[PDB]
């Protein structure tokens, strides 16, 4: 029998396996599995409300009761460990009657507001009432009622629907790492709340909407907008950061209605950040929809594609080749970056790079800008040393993995960098490179803790990559790693945390800034979605072309605007921090006269007189095969082939400037988020 | 002819995150990536001109990867397969809620 949901079962050793019977059937499960898990392996779906596979067992809803032979009482399958020879029955009259009684108790005080409850149509309570207890209600007394609580602009609250499953409280304590929700009172009058007035400030707060089985906690911005049966589901990935969280995009017509997490055990474990979940509002706001050239009065005027491309092509031939600069945005896909690099190199320029701190790093070896441990591999670490990175605001899901590892395996965390608020206990070791020198020289309790660690993990933030003393910092970090045997054939504990979705693919493709001051001497600047570059460094007489879907400052400076597709409207290749390559899936049509980025670059190259040897995205990917073949081998995990030993020795001195903060505002990180009501309100109240 | 050369995706839709039940998995679909719709300028209704607007999610279905691949290759469409993500069952114990913190450090 196939396991429920195709769940995979891993056996450490076949000797450590026991035999249990689920409705006569023989199934084999690892030692330590619960009765419910054995039922899932058998393919039998046990109803449940309070149990969640990613949260500690509670056993309070009593909906998972089954009959076990020689047991006097019905057994809570979610909590009872499986034993050899156990005979589990799930469809006996005892189990069915227990389920009917529990369902009757659940619906006793439940409000009659399905037509106004957003959970309607995707409600576990409705389905289990239809299936297990198809008992005619007989409760005729007065129902209890509960007042609503204010939890912020993201989570809408209707507490009459709450069934006291305590999933939200356990999520807050165990996953979010922010203990704000509790269960107050006693008996039937117990109420989930914060007691004092306070809003849920965790960056993972939005997941309580997913985990709540009833409509007690719902998305406030999504409230009443749509029913689940009229939504089209598209399976794609997020581009808010360099994590590549798997998401499902729900749309109705040419509009994205909501974004909910998608299961991926290796990346985000059915969780997403609040930025990922609530940034969809900006997709329909301040969209660049038509090509524009600034008119005589210095005002933008809408034109056709041919006219704008002719203007750009004509003016790009009037500058020196070293005076052409192209910058790729943080949301750029690999195909457009490759086409941009080819176009700029074929005009005789080498000034192509991706916006962000890691613009001019050494990209020779792939280990030097990727999380070599892998996100799932972090759970095996016994010590964490974070150098110049705030994972909570830089990579929310990576920080969630670190917090989960700390909670479960009692791993230690040492932090070097500016003061920051962590959701887990961690020693502040210092603020800058002097701490790195101290760590290298030893004589510290954390130094011997690092030496006494079996699987230590160093995580270096990409924000340190733009410092003047970058080589010295990297050399010191690698010396620390070598002295403590951090990199071994059985353990790669050296990691570099990127911040932008496009950064990994850009580094793989070789989009590296050679001249450190090429922007200050440029006369033709192509900003392909690079809204985060500082545009006052551009000379006032330079011809600036902006291509993208949003924009605030670069749009003001741009002489020509070329509307581009958004990540929800195209199929593009993105690589995350750990070197995992994924592809987006189109969910909605583009707006106005927008085009895909690589299409725009290829069209301009043809207009400019350069003939690129590809006319489709397949040709672009075949070209990419000659540069970074790992970018076209999508959804594959590959270990590092080369390590620190090949790096040339560096003797640069160590500067005294402390580490700076990369993400000043978690909600304001990209042009999509900066065009959203909800993100602005979160910045206003949740920060 | 014209519609037989389009590119499609063969995939198994994953479980929704709003429900704990698993009874809609194991089905295989052919995504026609129909993403050309607009608003009718009389009532605001969503209009389309693509014949495969909803057939991939309403009528066409396949019980296995091989059946969908065979259908796509017989019709001549260019298809890419996306393997579905599956959960890893891990040893969980209710006793873990009361783990000893050890002697004070």
């Amino acid at each position: 029998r196939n396991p429920v949901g195709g769940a995979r079962v891993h056996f450490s050793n076949p000797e450590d396996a026991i035999e249990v019977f689920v409705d006569g059937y023989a199934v084999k499960v690892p030692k330590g599995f619960t009765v419910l898990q054995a039922c899932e392996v058998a393919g039998v779906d046990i109803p449940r409300f309070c149990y969640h596979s990613r949260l500690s067992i509670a056993g309070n809803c009593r909906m998972c009761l089954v009959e076990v032979e020689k047991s006097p009482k019905p057994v809570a399958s979610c909590a009872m460990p499986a034993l050899p020879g156990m005979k589990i029955k799930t469809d006996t009259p005892i189990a069915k009657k227990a389920r009917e009684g529990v369902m009757e108790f659940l619906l006793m005080n439940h409000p009659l507001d399905c037509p106004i409850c957003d959970q309607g149509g995707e409600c576990d309570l409705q389905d289990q009432s239809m299936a297990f207890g198809s008992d005619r209600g007989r409760f005729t007394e007065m129902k209890r009622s509960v007042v609503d609580k204010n939890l912020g602009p993201l989570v809408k609250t209707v507490m009459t629907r709450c069934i006291q499953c305590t999933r939200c409280v356990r999520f807050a304590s165990e996953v979010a790492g922010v203990q704000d929700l509790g269960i107050l009172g006693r008996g039937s009058g117990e109420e989930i709340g914060t007691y004092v007035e306070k809003l849920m400030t965790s960056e993972l707060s939005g997941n309580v909407i997913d985990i709540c089985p009833v409509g007690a906690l719902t998305s406030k911005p999504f409230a009443f907008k749509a029913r689940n049966w009229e939504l089209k589901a598209t399976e794609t990935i997020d581009v808010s950061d360099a994590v590549g969280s798997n998401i499902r995009v729900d749309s109705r017509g040419p509009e994205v209605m909501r974004i909910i997490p998608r299961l991926n055990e290796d990346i985000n474990e059915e969780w997403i950040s609040d930025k990922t979940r609530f940034c969809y509002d900006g997709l329909k706001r301040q969209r660049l929809s038509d090509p524009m050239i600034r008119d005589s009065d210095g005002r933008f005027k809408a034109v056709s594609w041919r006219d704008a491309l002719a203007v750009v092509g004509d003016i790009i031939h009037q500058v020196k080749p070293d005076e052409i600069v192209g910058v790729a945005g943080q949301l750029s896909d690999a195909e457009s970056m490759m086409v941009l690099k080819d176009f700029v190199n074929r005009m005789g320029s080498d000034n192509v790079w991706c916006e962000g701190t890691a613009a001019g790093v050494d990209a020779d070896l792939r280990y030097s800008y990727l999380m070599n441990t892998s996100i799932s591999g972090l759970e095996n670490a016994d010590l964490f040393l974070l150098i110049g990175t705030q994972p909570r605001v830089e990579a929310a899901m990576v920080n969630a993995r670190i917090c989960k590892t700390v909670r479960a395996s009692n791993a230690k965390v040492g932090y070097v960098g500016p003061p920051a608020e962590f959701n887990y206990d961690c020693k502040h070791l210092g603020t800058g490179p002097d701490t790195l020198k101290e760590i290298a020289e030893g004589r510290h309790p954390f130094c011997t803790a690092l030496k006494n660690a079996k699987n230590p993990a160093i995580i270096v933030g990409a924000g340190l990559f733009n410092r003047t003393d970058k080589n010295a910092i990297l050399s010191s970090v690698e010396s620390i790693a070598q002295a403590n045997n951090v990199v071994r054939p059985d353990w790669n504990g050296l990691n570099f945390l990127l911040q932008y979705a496009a950064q990994a693919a850009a580094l793989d493709l070789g989009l590296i800034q050679q001249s450190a001051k090429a922007l200050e001497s440029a006369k033709f600047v192509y900003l392909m979605g690079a809204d985060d570059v500082n545009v006052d460094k551009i000379p006032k007489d330079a011809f600036v072309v902006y291509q993208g879907h949003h924009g605030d400052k670069a749009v003001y400076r741009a002489n020509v605007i070329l509307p581009a597709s958004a990540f929800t409207e195209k199929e593009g290749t993105y690589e995350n921090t750990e070197g995992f390559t994924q592809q987006t899936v189109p969910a909605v049509p583009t707006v106005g006269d927008a085009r895909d980025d690589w299409k725009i670059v290829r069209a301009l190259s043809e207009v400019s007189g350069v003939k690129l040897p590809y006319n489709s995205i397949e040709g672009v990917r075949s070209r990419i095969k000659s540069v970074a073949p790992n970018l076209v081998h999508t959804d594959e995990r590959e270990p590092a082939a080369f390590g620190p030993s090949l790096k040339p020795e560096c003797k640069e001195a160590m500067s005294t400037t402390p580490f700076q903060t990369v993400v000043e505002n978690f909600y304001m990180t990209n042009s999509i988020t900066r065009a959203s009501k909800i993100m602005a309100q979160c910045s206003a109240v949740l920060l | 002819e014209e519609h037989l050369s389009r590119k499609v995706i063969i995939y198994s839709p994953a479980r929704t995150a709003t429900q704990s039940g698993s009874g809609k998995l194991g089905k295989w679909k052919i995504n026609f990536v129909s993403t050309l719709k607009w608003e009718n300028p009389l009532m605001g209704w969503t209009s389309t001109g693509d014949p495969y607007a909803n057939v991939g999610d309403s009528a066409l279905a396949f019980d296995s990867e091989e059946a969908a691949k065979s259908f796509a290759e017989r019709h001549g469409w260019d298809y890419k397969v996306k393997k579905p993500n599956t959960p890893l069952l891990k040893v969980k114990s209710y006793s873990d809620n009361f783990k000893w913190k050890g002697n004070p450090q």
């Binding site: 597709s565 895909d596 043809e606 006319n615 | 993403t35 050309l36």
Partner: peptide
């Protein structure tokens, strides 16, 4: 004197 790609690009974003 232009390839089919440029005509399609001038037409729409759906080739």
């Amino acid at each position: 004197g232009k390839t089919d790609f440029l005509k399609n690009f001038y037409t729409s974003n759906y080739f």
